[PDB]
């Protein structure tokens, strides 16, 4: 059933500016749910586990493959978070809840529960810092985690009880994708590796070039360097497969602004619509706001700014205005030398 | 309750 | 039960290029097994208690060969680092979580370490710390751990516990031929280090005394407390294209046996393998690190090979692991 060219295709109805990503989680996909189609019946003895490691830079869209994926996959889907995680339930959480929640998704069916997916979000967030310490969100909750991603059988009363009984459902045929904004991991990379600094005529100096330092670098991690950062070594052994997202290309960004149906100019001009004047935006525009947003380097979810802060004043005194058919947005008002002209 | 390490 | 030809035997099966780390762990496991056997039934009361040490290069499979020899010998076996000390009570505990219940029965478990050369006492809070803490926990106690989180704590003896101290010591070569061998490498008539890939350094390391590890900054009262001293070998590049084919398990038996599933047959050839072992060389990472360029190299054939049809099987060219071409597809 489930196919790695089309799947490919489906998420770049929704997503844009990660094709090597696409590759990685079609061929993890593909092989974890073929695995449970004949288990352990095959002649290779020992075959590794099929898990998936989300690694890239905010706005990356590590948080919209969740939810794409889960809309295009049949079996049920969990978005979960590390913060709420805590160890031994004192007051926060347990781990044990997550599996509760899948359970309300596939309504109490432990043979459609086992087939589905999990995806946990700010996986940075249970890095192991006990260097002054006891820590309730540090190596007690990876160590529990660690025990669920291996496989284990967990009680879970089922609907809670109106009993004193509970089911084992299975957990290594569950999948868990593993995912967050990683915060420094790049500087322990470049750390490790960096080739350079060379005083003599023969050797060269790269001062502003850093080989690609959004993608490459992350193409070029193992997992000794996430050791350094906090996490197991243990934990990172079960997920063989890792995804590396590049920084969003100012093409890519221009993409973002107008396929999507989420797009920033169709909700405003829409917006601007029930008020009764129309939103023009140039092609000029576009590729102006993308310089100014890769500036930032806060990925599409700080591109906003830069078209609201343009607009502040033009959404200020417009209902004020009035015969104003249509607006007309140049270039220069991204830049904001210039103040838009309105069309009458 | 909480828990303080430092030095 | 078993016997030191057996159990190398079933340590070939999964381990090669490493005869005398075989014969090390074989008698101190079967004798340290037999401890619990007899107990003190015999005269010789207050007996066993003798630690492994693993010094080698990255890579060469020391962790592999307790976690191979735990399922063999179906005995629990955990995987602690000293790297994160500055807890000791983490490393007990530990090995509980395994079962999470275990009197009379984790006793006889083993436990792996990793970057023990780390801790060396650098002349310094960061190092010397742990040496002078973990003497006590390899001379035996019991720790407080409690059982499943929770209200009754538990005490666990750690004598009966083995300890396996692995580690990578760079450098440690050129400190003893300077004492052993010759003093040489900055001179004219002194030899250079020219052979530093030519030939394998391990046979220096065969002659390394608990007073070398001294010089390299290790305690020797900690050293004491792991007399047996096991030396790896230098791993060969014919040694990476055995660890594909030779072992029990290995990659392309599992990737063969995965496309078996689909239908489809894979066919790895010799010219193919040697140029894995020359790029996974420049990463340094060993076998630990092989496993990646494979899944990189592979990815783009596994992502189209469901969408194509009627190949019957699959063939993979040396041009495919430098990057240049695409493998080969029999239908
Ligand atoms: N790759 C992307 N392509 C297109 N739009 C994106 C992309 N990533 C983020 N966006 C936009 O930003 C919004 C929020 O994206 P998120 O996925 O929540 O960002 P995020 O950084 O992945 O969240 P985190 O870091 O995992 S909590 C989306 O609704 C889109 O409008
Ligand atoms: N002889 C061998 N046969 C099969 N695999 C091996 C062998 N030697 C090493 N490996 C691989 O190396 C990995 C373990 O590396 P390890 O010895 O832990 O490196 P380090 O000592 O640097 O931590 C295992 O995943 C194992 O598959």
Redesign the pocket.
Same mark, same amino acid.
Not at chain 1, 15 to 18: A, K, L, S, W
Not at chain 1, 56 to 64: D, E, I, N
């Given at each position: 059933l489930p196919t790695p060219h089309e799947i490919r295709n489906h998420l770049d109805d929704y997503? +844009? *500016? @990660?094709e090597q990503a696409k590759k990685v989680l079609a061929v993890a996909v593909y092989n974890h749910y073929k695995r449970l189609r004949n288990g352990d019946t095959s002649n290779g003895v020992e075959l590794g586990k099929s898990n998936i490691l989300l690694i *890239? #830079?905010? *706005?990356?869209?590590?948080? $919209?493959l969740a939810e794409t994926l889960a809309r295009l996959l049949d079996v049920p889907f969990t978005m979960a978070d590390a913060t709420t995680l805590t160890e031994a339930g004192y007051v926060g959480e347990d781990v044990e809840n997550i599996i509760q929640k899948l359970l309300q998704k596939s309504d109490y069916d432990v043979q459609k529960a086992q087939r589905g997916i999990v995806y946990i979000? @700010?996986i940075d967030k249970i890095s192991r810092k006990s260097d002054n310490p006891r820590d309730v969100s540090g190596e007690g909750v990876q160590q529990a985690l660690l025990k669920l991603i291996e496989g284990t059988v967990a009680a879970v009363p089922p609907q809670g009880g109106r009993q004193q009984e509970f089911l084992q459902v299975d957990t290594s045929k569950i999948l868990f994708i593993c =995912? *967050? &904004?990683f915060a420094g991991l790049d500087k322990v990379i470049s750390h490790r590796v960096e080739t350079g600094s060379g005083i003599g005529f023969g050797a060269t100096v790269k001062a502003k070039s850093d080989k690609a330092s959004e993608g490459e670098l992350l193409a070029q991690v193992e997992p000794e360097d996430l050791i350094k950062f906090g996490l197991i070594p243990e934990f990172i052994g079960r997920l063989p497969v890792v995804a590396t997202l590049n920084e $969003?290309s100012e093409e &890519?960004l221009i993409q +973002?602004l107008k396929e #999507?149906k989420?797009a920033l100019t169709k909700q405003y001009q829409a917006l601007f619509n029930l008020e009764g004047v129309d939103l023009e935006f140039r092609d000029e525009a576009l590729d102006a706001i993308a310089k100014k947003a890769m500036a930032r380097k806060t =990925? &599409?979810?700080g591109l906003r700014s830069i078209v609201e802060a343009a607009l502040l004043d033009t959404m200020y005194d417009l209902p004020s205005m009035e015969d104003v058919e249509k607006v007309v947005i140049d270039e220069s008002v991204i830049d904001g030398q210039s103040e838009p002209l309105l069309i009458y | 309750x909480x828990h303080x390490x430092x030095x």
């Open positions: 997503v +844009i *500016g @990660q *890239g #830079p905010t *706005g990356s869209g590590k948080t $919209l979000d @700010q =995912g *967050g &904004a $969003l &890519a +973002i #999507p989420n =990925g &599409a979810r | -």
